[PDB]
Amino acid sequence: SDVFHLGLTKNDLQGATLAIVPGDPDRVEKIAALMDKPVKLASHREFTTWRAELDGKPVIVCSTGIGGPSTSIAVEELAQLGIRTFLRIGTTGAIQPHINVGDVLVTTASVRLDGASLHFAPLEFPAVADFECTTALVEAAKSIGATTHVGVTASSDTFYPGQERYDTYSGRVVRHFKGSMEEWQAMGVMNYEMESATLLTMCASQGLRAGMVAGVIVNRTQMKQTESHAVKIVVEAARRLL
Amino acid sequence: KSDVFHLGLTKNDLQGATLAIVPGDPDRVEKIAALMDKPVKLASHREFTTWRAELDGKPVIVCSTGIGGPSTSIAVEELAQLGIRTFLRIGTTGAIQPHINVGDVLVTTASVRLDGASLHFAPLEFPAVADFECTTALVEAAKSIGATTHVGVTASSDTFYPGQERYDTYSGRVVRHFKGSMEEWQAMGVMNYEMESATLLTMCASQGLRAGMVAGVIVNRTQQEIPNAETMKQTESHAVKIVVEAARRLL
Amino acid sequence: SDVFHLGLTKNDLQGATLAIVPGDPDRVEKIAALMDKPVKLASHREFTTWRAELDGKPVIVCSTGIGGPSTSIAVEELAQLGIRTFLRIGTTGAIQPHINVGDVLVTTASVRLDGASLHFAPLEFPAVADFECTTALVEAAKSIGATTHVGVTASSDTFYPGQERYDTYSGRVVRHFKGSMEEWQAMGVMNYEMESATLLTMCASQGLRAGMVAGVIVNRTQQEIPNAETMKQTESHAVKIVVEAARRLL
Amino acid sequence: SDVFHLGLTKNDLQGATLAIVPGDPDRVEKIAALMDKPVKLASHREFTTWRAELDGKPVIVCSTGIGGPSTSIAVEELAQLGIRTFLRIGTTGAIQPHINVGDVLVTTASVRLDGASLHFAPLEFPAVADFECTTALVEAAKSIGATTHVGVTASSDTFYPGQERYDTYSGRVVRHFKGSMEEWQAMGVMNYEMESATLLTMCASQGLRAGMVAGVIVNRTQQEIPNAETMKQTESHAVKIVVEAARRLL
Amino acid sequence: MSKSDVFHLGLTKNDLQGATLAIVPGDPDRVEKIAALMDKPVKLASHREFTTWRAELDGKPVIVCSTGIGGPSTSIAVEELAQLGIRTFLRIGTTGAIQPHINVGDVLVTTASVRLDGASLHFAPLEFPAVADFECTTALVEAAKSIGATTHVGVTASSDTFYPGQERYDTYSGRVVRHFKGSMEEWQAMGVMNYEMESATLLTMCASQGLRAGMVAGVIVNRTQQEIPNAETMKQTESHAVKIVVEAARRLL
Amino acid sequence: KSDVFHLGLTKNDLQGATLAIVPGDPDRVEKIAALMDKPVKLASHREFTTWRAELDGKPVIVCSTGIGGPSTSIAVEELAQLGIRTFLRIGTTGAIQPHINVGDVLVTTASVRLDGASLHFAPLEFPAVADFECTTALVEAAKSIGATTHVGVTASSDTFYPGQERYDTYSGRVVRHFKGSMEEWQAMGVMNYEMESATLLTMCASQGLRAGMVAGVIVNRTQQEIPNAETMKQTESHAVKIVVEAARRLL
Lengths: 242, 251, 250, 250, 253, 251
Ligand SMILES: O=c1[nH]c(=O)n(COCCO)cc1Cc1ccccc1
Ligand SMILES: O=c1[nH]c(=O)n(COCCO)cc1Cc1ccccc1
Ligand SMILES: O=c1[nH]c(=O)n(COCCO)cc1Cc1ccccc1
Ligand SMILES: O=c1[nH]c(=O)n(COCCO)cc1Cc1ccccc1
Ligand SMILES: O=c1[nH]c(=O)n(COCCO)cc1Cc1ccccc1
Ligand SMILES: O=c1[nH]c(=O)n(COCCO)cc1Cc1ccccc1
Ligand SMILES: [K+]
Ligand SMILES: [K+]
Ligand SMILES: [K+]
Hints:
- The PDB classes it as transferase.
- 6 copies of one chain form a homohexamer.
- By secondary structure, chain A is an alpha/beta fold.
- The first copy, chain A, has a single domain (1-242), classed as Rossmann fold (3-Layer(aba) Sandwich).
- Chain A has 7 helices and 10 strands.
- Chains in contact: A-B, A-C, A-D, A-E, B-C, B-D, B-F, C-E, C-F, D-E, D-F, E-F.
- Chains E and F meet through helix 2 of E and helix 2 of F.
- The structure holds the ligand O=c1[nH]c(=O)n(COCCO)cc1Cc1ccccc1 (6 copies) and potassium ion (K) (3 copies).
- One ligand BAU is lined by residues 66, 91-93, 159, 163, 192-194, 217-218, 226 of chain D.
- Residues 26, 69, 93-96, 162, 166, 195-197, 220-221, 229 of chain E line the site of one ligand BAU.
């Protein structure tokens, strides 16, 4: 093993430069099976890595897990293995009334409500997606004819209080995040998720291309085929970036 | 006489314009407007000079922001009050990467917020990101005219000297916070320094307004410091042609 | 399922109030097998849950994954199901020359180099462990006999730059963390890990009891690369302590 | 030109060490006209410069534009050309009920709601005016018999949200500035303007003398619309004070 | 052979007679009272807010030195005592409870403090925990059990201010700055037991410099029940607290 | 026998006094009070010693704050509750500029806020500025007794050692934030270090109270560290004379 956590060698990658990074290690199989020749490489902790072939080119699918910390481990160790392009596919909760469940969202940049992004760049540095990756995701979304929204995402280090969920054990939200969802809503923030800020910050500050796409399964103001549309987009976008 | 506090403009003066090209220098306003059809002067107050022009039979606004976020925030807000929804900034810049040359054009995806005014619209964690349609149109226009183009992050500073780590000053010192900052931005892939983008991009992205940012390189910090007069005028003319062509796609 | 992620009902726990929380879901099977009647309950994403019995009382073993974010999900959803006591078992990298590989470390409180803890309490609030949980873990370490150190742990949101590793792709560390390891070293900080700051903060600020124990598998001052043979014996040593500590808190 | 923006050489100043620095380039000639031998030097961007004579000694008038960023350019480049004393003449909106339109305000120090000041000194450093400049301004105001208030000014990087204006496109203010005007009011802050924090901080931290004086054209507690009946007299009153204070500092 | 080995305390290392443990009350008037509970009590020095006494406990020299109110003077006292050879610190204070279940007369042992002070930042950044030494904490808790008391163990809010930082409105201005407006309620919901004014500095500076520190306090007021303390209960609570800190010192020698 | 929580004073004890001289040291209170007519001890509790004296037939309070903002904040608040509206601090200080000598008197216009207590009254951006009338009176009084005076900015620290970059300690280390801090303050023209002014000036300027700050230089950090036995009293005498003379102008 060349890496500390993923349990992979540079040879296992077969010269892959692009990697599709879902949050769920159980989704890794689903995405890899859509491409030609799916092969399981290694499964350690929350990192399941599958190698596939797209247009005659080797492509890596590797889970990041929930949150910036394990995302930062996976992305760094994949970069050590030779990956230059990272395309994230996630689930999301929309906070705008006009965004329906089932919609696909392309993130231009993220509100940094995480801690790991700070370990790569100070807060003033924008958690911006790569322009070529964003273009490929937008054009791929139009290719399969999905309802798409492009804009800013709030990337939280937590699922509950940082997304202002009150349906909890304590039933309280710390002062800092009290009324925060309404603030993001008025600022035109589309949605909540938990990985983008870290991924986009660490890639844009280290000379790596990164894209972010998500499927809406819940709208906070108001499931199978939702992932089907999004997975088809991230694979189609990968075709354009190879 | 005026609907706004600073610009000296009425909604009627705009003639239904929704797009504004926003240079920093008031002296550049007429030069940009002269490239389009039916150029007419509207107003001049403080650092805010406004001209109206026509593009593909549609009214377009040219309005100076002045140097820095504060006067930019005034101009953008008051233009939004009069009906402007799309803002295309054209500015000057100093590059900090060796591979970018003098004369090159830079399209900003998002900005490092080394300003104060952006914080008056959104907390620091909010990205100073440009609108996707605007950025696309600027990149597409740059390739259309045939120019050396770089796309990426811009450091937007409230200061010309210490915040861009210049030591050739009266004091000769840089505050601890900005000591060694240029080298950090360089390693982080930041292309350049300017003084308005962070405020403009933050206030637009957090208020439902479309904003784009483009700049011509007149100096490279890793190479020289004294720019050439002829090269400066040619660089400005190249970037102005790009921003006007980008405006065409966004009407 | 009564929760959004773990895939467990209140009935699945059988009135369990204590939970041992490892980072690695592959460790969940190992820890639960050392107790009486081990049964697998669920496995979703990075959350693997096993039910066990200790001294005639049901106990939970549930993986949090690496980092505060998923740790915050696991703890919150277990608290919804009735868990009031949390005992973290982890792996760590020691930064003090006097601490060796194979040693067991008990955390009194953590340096908050994480983001999730801020979602529960402002930075000024201490990421402190429960006194009874800390007492039990130290007493359990004294019981089975192992070289133990009690003190402060640096809990980072990252494995590399936040722990000042330069052996990376970029080879650079952000200004904020430049010379940080030396700073913590002089401050008497024992070690680096990635989950304690979040767990300790969210529990201490929500009326939940939390303890933190870790086995030293690497020392940052001398040796290079964790040995496979030493890793297994250090893991099993710390696991024995956490189960014995769970006995004292029930 | 010896400088990057002002378009001035050291010779143009003729030994001047004092500058009066208004925000509006149009006000420059009007200030210079009150002194002997007023001469235009340059006009580039928002930076217009005039040279005049006071008591047989050369004095500079130079516009900064709105905001700290362009102020920081004007002041720095003027300092390179030899200016040691900077006297700001501005306009302002009062936030205290007892301060009337037409009143003159002398700033002892500023609340730093700007970005540029941070590029010279960290937030904890006070945006304090020079004692001699402040004394001169206060004494100059007493000579002409103007209604004068001496105290703290809130210096904002923005005209609208940072001054808690809601009559805007969005009609909202970011959380940080929500209820901020009321806070400053209770704290005895006199007024809002947009250049003083930057000027005072960069001068006080670099060994340069700076004073701040402003005329009240609006009081935020009574109305919003500036009264043209007094908007002519207010500027004339304050311009006279800054010129008289310059005489005392020559 | 000397007069003072330090800048403020007016003490020589020789005055300490080999003492490594100090009990540190806030009040200089409380110094004599704590020392008189131990053998051979002698006054060493009185300068500014720093009053120092030496006493004997189980045949071992022990120091009692007042820090004064607040982190700044605490930082001077702890640093200069550390220069004189002190390696263990036990703080005994007064405090106001903010939890409804904590009564006046109860004793509180602090595991760690909310850092609402400035001086702690001069030793470690905010993210560093203001945590008490585990052995010192064990000593204080066991000492409370041994002599019998109502004891609560947990987090203390340590404020650089008595009034606004503890959300007192019955003041000259009657206002509390935005940052601290509604702060007591937040601390209450977070399970914070009490307010005092020295622990954050003491615990941060000791834990970040290899010095052992403990923190104990007697509640003379409950904020949900009253504002003005009873003069009689104050003395009884103090006496009760003084005995616990001396007994904890016995177990640390 | 007390209207307040700590000081042990009633409004009647002040006899209508509106001005207080506030040293850091309780032991110094009598020395300052003895410089005026008919000095009487009022109270001594904790680090708070209060004396009352007569100045030109008018009552004047002398009350110790103790070292640091926290106890300063208690003393100032409770004195304000008792009717004090003007506060004149007399302190000791360590100078950090080479041109300032031991024995010199420093008048503070405003303070660098290296304290915690000032934040409990006003956010960091608020200036720890002295009252203009109080500063004027202290500068005028300095000329009245004929002392060498410097007027400017003071760094007010919550600690004597690391926050003033002293390495002569038990640990021998200074936290990253204050590493190289003295040099920065020196370059910024900061005159000196003390431990009470930031809190006093901030809490007074934000609550409608008048505050002045003066200090006697007993050590200069660029020449020596141990304060002299003979010189200490000489600088104390001059500085104490100025604060009393400044009080005369403010009655
Ligand atoms: O609201 C959300 N917030 C969020 O951070 N995500 C992202 O996926 C992360 C973990 O489930 C997904 C959602 C949708 C959702 C809603 C309810 C239950 C589960 C998932
Ligand atoms: O280095 C720069 N930094 C920067 O913020 N800008 C932007 O234009 C702002 C004001 O002149 C422009 C430049 C190029 C430059 C260099 C020297 C003199 C003038 C302009
Ligand atoms: O140095 C460390 N830092 C750290 O945060 N941990 C915690 O476990 C987290 C994930 O592997 C564990 C270690 C030991 C180590 C060292 C090298 C490789 C793997 C593990
Ligand atoms: O309220 C104010 N705030 C403020 O920062 N200024 C300063 O001058 C700045 C630019 O116009 C001036 C005013 C008075 C004012 C009010 C309404 C319209 C125009 C000017
Ligand atoms: O509420 C308090 N807060 C606090 O910080 N302390 C600590 O002792 C400090 C100085 O009196 C003590 C108390 C109890 C109290 C209440 C009212 C008056 C006096 C003392
Ligand atoms: O260097 C100093 N720093 C400082 O904060 N003060 C103020 O008085 C505070 C406590 O002694 C005084 C001094 C002078 C000094 C130097 C050495 C010993 C004692 C006093
Ligand atoms: K995880
Ligand atoms: K400007
Ligand atoms: K004190």
